[model samples]
Target chain A: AKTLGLHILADLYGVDADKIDRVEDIRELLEGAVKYANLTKISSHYYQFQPHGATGVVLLASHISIHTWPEHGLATVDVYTCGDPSKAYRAMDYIITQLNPKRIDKQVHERGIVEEESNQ
Target chain B: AKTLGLHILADLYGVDADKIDRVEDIRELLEGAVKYANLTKISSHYYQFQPHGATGVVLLASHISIHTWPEHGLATVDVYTCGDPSKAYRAMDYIITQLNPKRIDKQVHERGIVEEESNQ
Candidate 1:
């Protein structure tokens, strides 16, 4: 119960289907999000669905999980970061901005007891 | 917001650190969690940290992101599922039980607007 960081769970509605259909675009956005948060980008992996239009991927140390439904114009994102609370907040903000959803619902949770050195 | 599914964000404390340090062990737990929830397990990917015993892995349709820090006896888990309301709950419960943490803090969010048919 010390201090971990910020964890954001978000629902994005009325987004552009075309914008989220491609794995590359999502990877790019994910990269930018992590970069802006100043977290380490270890690597990424993605898979496209057989039914089509679903791309699921995990980004980096921040653990950004992105799942998209191109037909429904919806996407769900989970961003979790440790040590620095600012990282996940900035990353989530960047994602919400770039995705450009017509409506959004988000919740922020505090994760605790990390090896928090700076004590923020 | 129709009702997508359920999202559970959790922080487990006072856990047995050695139980979560290995990727194979964590994968086994993850597989069991997904199975208990009755979700599809497409595949799994894991990477071990270079400096120490950090394993980050993403599992299945539930998008369970697991990060473990053995030195701290702490683990963070994210469970998100779409469609069946029962899946994520079952999955998260299974995880918590198996992990056997002395203390846990959890938050559950309703992910909205899935193409749900059963009307649960």
Candidate 2:
């Protein structure tokens, strides 16, 4: 089935606050996830907030992005993958592992492009 | 009333395929949408596919992203906005207006951070 992709959106709570504020650490973690997913690393951007938190985007045909609020011990993540659907899930899980979130709320919009496969 | 943000995810069909294959045109349209939403663009990446299609990500406090498949007259867009919720809707509408898709399938995840407000 040729589809746009899979999108995994998540909100993680009770994560280690310190993990979300470091741009260097986030970048390295995402790159490792990319490697684990076997996705090629195109150009990416990781921007840090003034005092706390950081945001990152890694482009791999599609992309994986994250916004963190270390002050709240919270973070949100998006993983959209073009080819292998499992990659999105795998990458996101790896992130959750590293962030060590105690509570996780996630959704997988299966078969993207407006859920053509499961139109309601 | 303080929440993570809003995420607008859409699949646009029946658009002019040619409009999406060009990075310059797509970039300009997105930038226009960003401006219209009163969001500041920190940095962005627009990557062109080998023969057709293109992927773009514009980083604001959160971000907006798109993947286009010109051959299918299909494009998927995402606008995630922090603070004001209207910006996400407005920006997405502006993009849709510019793209002019005949059939649009859209979902707005209000008060994001995994839809805490709408947990079902």
Candidate 3:
């Protein structure tokens, strides 16, 4: 089966509350992850919430996004890539280490897998 | 209980294959959808794959993304919103009408939901 993309959805539990709350920190983490994964970055957006938390989005043919809640000590990550699935995972590894989460609930999916008309 | 965000994952089937394959069309659809939703657009990137297919990513405080495989008549859409969840759903509805998908498998999630630490 040909895989069109790799999508990883993760929830980091007991993460460093302060680290996840900083927009700049999250931006830096994602920028580093993109570099480490060798994914091309076309543009990016990061937003800081009024009192706490932040959200960041990076546009690659591969895509990465993060949302955090400091009070809950939780962070959510979405990493999707159309090329080199391993690179996405590697980026996740770097993020997990930086956030230092006590536990992670992660799910991986091979997106857009389809059978040939004849095979179907 | 405070609401955090809305995440919608949808697989659009039986779409007009050509429409999904065109990068320009997808871009227009997304731009229209963003306007319809009354969401702020920070930036966007769209890519057309050789022969067929395309991917588009748009950044709002909320985010929207679309990936399509024309051969299979499939398009996947992700709309996540930190503000008014209804706005994201409205955008999805507009895209569905524009794509004219015969069938859609969609899931809506209340992301980042957590009880107050004091209540725990």
Best by lDDT: 2
Task: Please report, in order, the local distance difference test score of every candidate based on alpha carbons.
Answer: 0.75, 0.84, 0.83
DockQ each: 0.43, 0.33, 0.46
TM-score of every candidate: 0.84, 0.90, 0.83
- Model 3 lDDT tens row, A1-120: 576778887878898777987888889999988988888876787888768888788877557989888888988899888868998898888888888998777877776666545644
State the TM-score for model 2. 0.90
Per-residue alpha-carbon lDDT of model 3 for B27-108, expressed as tens digits?
Answer: 9999999999888887777888768888788877557999888988999899888869899899988888899988777877
Superposition TM-score, candidate 3 onto the true structure: 0.83
- The segments of candidate 1 whose C-alpha lies over 4 angstroms from its true place after superposition are A50-52, A114-120, B50-52, B114-120
lDDT-superior candidate, 2 or 3? 2
Best by TM-score: 2
Worst 10 residues of 3 chain B by lDDT: B111-120
Name model 2 segments beyond 4 Å from true. Answer: A111-120, B111-120
Alpha-carbon interface RMSD for all candidates, in angstroms? 2.5, 3.7, 2.1
RMSD of each: 4.1, 4.6, 2.8
**Pairs clashing within candidate 3:** none
User: What would the C-alpha RMSD of candidate 2 be, to one decimal place?
Assistant: 4.6
Candidate 2 interface RMSD after superposing interface residues: 3.7
| Local accuracy of candidate 1 as per-residue lDDT tens digits, A17-98 | 8778877767787888888878786667776664544545554655777788787788888787777777888988898899
Best by DockQ: 3
Query: Native-contact recovery for every candidate?
Result: 0.25, 0.20, 0.35
Q: On residues B1-120, what C-alpha lDDT tens digit does candidate 2 reach at each position?
A: 357788889988988988898888779989999999998888989998978888899989699998888877888899998888899888998999999999877787753343335446
